[PDB]
Design a protein around this ligand. Structure first.
Ligand SMILES: *[C@@H]1O[C@H](CO)[C@@H](O)[C@H](O)[C@H]1NC(C)=O
Lengths: 49, 42, 64
């Protein structure tokens, strides 16, 4: 690997993210988006689950 | 889920004291572990 | 570039061996690899280029 190599011969960093869902608790997921809290109005709410 | 509940209380006693209290959840471990036997460590 | 040429060489060797159905082909490819390996280590550009050209032809013949 040299800084002067053509692109096909330049180094590339590779990360493979293998995703498995085995018979177990699955706590591996993205963030859960939250909104502003609204009071004194009729709302359709979702608190946790 | 391996769920651990606990309660600590002072005693003055060779046996378990008579009385009532409830244990609160302390830890909840998302492990997926197959448990059939256990040991106590001193 | 000598390192780009060396990378081409090892790529040609892998594929040449992959398609080397017979023993005569494997032996020729391994001999060419050895020659290229020595040429590379000793920074002999001309020997390395000649071996690579032969490997390229060899592989094209195996593929066709
Ligand atoms: C968990 O234990 C049960 C027996 O109570 C067994 O049948 C099951 O196959 C075990 N699961 C795993 C993943 O070992």
């Amino acid at each position: 690997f040299q800084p002067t190599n053509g692109v096909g011969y330049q180094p590339y960093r590779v990360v493979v993210l293998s995703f498995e869902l085995l018979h177990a608790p699955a706590t591996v997921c993205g963030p859960k988006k939250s909104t502003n809290l609204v009071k004194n109005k009729c709302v359709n709410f979702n608190f946790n689950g | 889920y391996f769920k651990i509940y606990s309660k600590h209380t002072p005693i003055n006693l060779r046996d378990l004291p008579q009385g009532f209290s409830a244990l609160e959840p302390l830890v909840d471990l998302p492990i997926g572990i197959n448990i059939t036997r256990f040991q106590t460590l001193l | 570039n000598d390192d780009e040429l060396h990378m081409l060489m090892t790529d040609l060797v892998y594929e040449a061996l992959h398609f080397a159905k017979d023993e005569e082909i494997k032996k020729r490819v391994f001999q060419l690899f050895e020659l290229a390996d020595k040429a590379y280590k000793n920074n002999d550009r001309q020997k390395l280029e000649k071996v690579v050209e032969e490997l390229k032809e060899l592989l094209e013949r195996l593929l066709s």
